[PDB]
Amino acid sequence: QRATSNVFAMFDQSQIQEFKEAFNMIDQNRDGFIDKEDLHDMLASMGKNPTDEYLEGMMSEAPGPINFTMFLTMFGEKLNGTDPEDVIRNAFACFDEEASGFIHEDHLRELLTTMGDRFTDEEVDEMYREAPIDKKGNFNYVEFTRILKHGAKDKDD
Amino acid sequence: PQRATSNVFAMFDQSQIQEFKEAFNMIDQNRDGFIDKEDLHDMLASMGKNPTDEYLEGMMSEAPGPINFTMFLTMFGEKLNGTDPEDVIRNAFACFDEEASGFIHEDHLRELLTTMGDRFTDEEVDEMYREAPIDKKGNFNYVEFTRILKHGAKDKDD
Amino acid sequence: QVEEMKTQLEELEDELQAAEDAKLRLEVNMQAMKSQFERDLQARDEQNE
Amino acid sequence: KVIQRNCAAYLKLRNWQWWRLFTKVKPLLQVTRQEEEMQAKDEELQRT
Amino acid sequence: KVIQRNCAAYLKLRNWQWWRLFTKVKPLLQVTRQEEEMQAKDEELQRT
């Protein structure tokens, strides 16, 4: 047999159907596995040139556990305890009465970087630099939540 | 009549066979077009808890050997007859009582069901009482009843 | 011959059951929608009243 | 009485004649979601 | 505290980017065909 199984649990019902569409569109030959020939030549269709062998490296992570069903198991395994952005939006809006993305940069600095969780300033600079900065130098926690959930963009090829 | 269903469930809409082929594809982890002990004992275990009773051999013995896609489709095809989707039942329930509030009183329900038409026993009619959720004070709602009769709603979950 | 004649048996019985049942219940719906239309008639009647 | 007793008998005999196969109908809701969403989009567009 | 427990937790995954490793073009596959209907539903809801 294929010999792959795990304890099943639902994480996002409104996402699995898109996950199954993604699995179908990559799996042109309808194999259920992950193949370098199947994906790399297909990635180069819309992509520029993903010829570097990090793909074979990542398909070499574990010996033959790949299947459509376990594609949910790995993602749920990585990430657990996730809340929708809108309730997270309310949580962000809790401290600031404006609740219009005008969270001040120094407000966020003074609060998060030092008081409460004592950590370095670097672990916030990546949000400072990678993510866009709101007008006047604010924290547009609306589009910030959007990029936390789905709006994060990078090189699309 | 013969009730052999020579054609492959031709007396029905074809949408349900796309849902059935999706179900077949998702149960067929081997994906060879045939069910298997390997197939069900893990796909049923995906939501189940590895049952000890050997009723998947019940399926493979109901239709001997591994069953074809068409075999699965026709063994469901013999399971559908003399029934219609929710629209007609809803319209009839709207017809019989003008108020359409679904206040089918228990005495009224039994009078309208067991007494006239094809004679059958109220004792077997009681299966509609001990299992189906009847509303209180005698009246009996139908919209939830229609939904549970169709695939829209289920009383419980595994 | 017997195979094809019972094929017409099944086909025609299923089609006649479906068609006649739909027709009778559709006349039931005919009466029902006529009743709702006449309730709308009395609604306009009480507005005029 | 004819139609509804026929339907009721057919469902009640098959309420547990093939109970298990009627209980694997769980993924039907998951697989019908695309068509249901497209349709509901159509009717909400006409209700707009 | 309930803000801190999950924000950086996801942003810690952003430092892990396992999803990126095989779906650097994940937004591209997200905007194939489904984005049209999510945008249509969102616009219909906000206009309503």
Place this chain on the structure above:
Amino acid sequence: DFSEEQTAEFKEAFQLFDRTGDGKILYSQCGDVMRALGQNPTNAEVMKVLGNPKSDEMNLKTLKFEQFLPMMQTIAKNKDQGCFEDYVEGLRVFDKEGNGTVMGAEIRHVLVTLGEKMTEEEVEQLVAGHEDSNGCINYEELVRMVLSG
């Protein structure tokens, strides 16, 4: 007798009036079905049918489908056939101004002055069927409507 078509109609009525046992027939049930199956005269035929004015037991008034058939014939020999000329003249005598301005009260009065009366819900039900306004009909429309069954 006619062909077996009328026997088939009586049989389907028999299975139609099958409450409290298909086999037994109540004289009330048979009277209702025979009336509705195109025989108006039903008032005084209880004595002409039973031969016994006994009308005390509602539960068991014995009748069977076998002897039911000649009963239908001896009723259907049409012992009485009236026509609307007598009816309209009686109503126009009952009429007051020749047009029927407000006939609602007096028709109820004349039907409650008769000794052999049975129902009041039908009396309030007669408003249906073009008899809607305050006795607007000069009785021709209602006579035409009733003489259509």
